């Protein structure tokens, strides 16, 4: 649990101390059609069906 | 050529996983001790790093595997 605050800071300057105190990594990936799976796809439960169909 | 010595299991040490806490309390499992004597472990002028080939379990795992999910079946 933490406080995130800004009055027109950059998002980098906003996250910087929170990420360092919490020991967290911000990660980004570009979704490339054809080669990547959909970014929000995941499986669930006993039989391992997709969590959201379609 | 690299020298190979066979090491043979002779007692059945199979046990039921299901009564056990996780991870298994190895001080109270059934155990066989195997001794092998090598007459000349290293004839050479150089250090030798030994290699071992070890047999895994002959009994089928407790749960099937689903690609894309962690396999929770290890304890049983």
Chain A contact present for B69, CB below 8 A? yes
**d(C-alpha A38, C-alpha A32), whole Å:** 9
B17 and B76 Cβ atoms separated by less than 8 Å: yes
**d(C-alpha A38, C-alpha A5), whole Å:** 32
- Separation in Å, CA of A51 to nearest CA in chain B: 12
**d(C-alpha B53, C-alpha B2), whole Å:** 14
A20 and B38 Cβ atoms separated by less than 8 Å: no
Chain A contact present for B72, CB below 8 A? no
The one-character DSSP state at A49 is E
Burial class (CB in 10 A: 0-12, 13-18, 19+), A15: middle
| Residues of A whose CB is below 8 A from B69 | 43, 48
**d(C-alpha B75, C-alpha B62), whole Å:** 9
Resolution given for this structure, in angstroms: 2.8
User: What is each CA distance from A37 to A5, A40, A41, A47, B71, in whole angstroms?
Assistant: 34, 9, 7, 20, 21
B51 and B38 Cβ atoms separated by less than 8 Å: no
Q: How many CB pairs under 8 A join A and B?
A: 7
CA nearest A50 in B: which residue? B68
SS3 track for A2-48: CCCCCCCCCHHHHHHHHHHHHCCCCCCCCCCCCCCCCCCCCEECCCC
């Amino acid at each position: 649990l933490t406080i995130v605050f800004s009055r027109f800071k950059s998002f980098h300057d906003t996250a910087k101390n929170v990420l360092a105190d919490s020991q967290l990594t911000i990660v980004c990936r570009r979704y490339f059609h054809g080669e990547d799976p959909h970014p929000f796809a995941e499986l669930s439960g006993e039989l391992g069906l997709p969590l959201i169909e379609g | 050529d690299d020298v190979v010595y066979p090491i043979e299991v002779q007692e059945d040490t199979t046990f039921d996983p299901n009564p056990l806490p996780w991870p298994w309390p190895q001080p109270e499992l059934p155990v066989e001790d195997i001794e092998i004597t090598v007459p000349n472990a290293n004839p050479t002028d150089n250090i030798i790093w030994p290699k071992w080939t070890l047999p895994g379990s002959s009994e089928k795992p407790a749960e099937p595997y689903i690609p894309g999910l962690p396999w929770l079946g290890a304890p049983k």
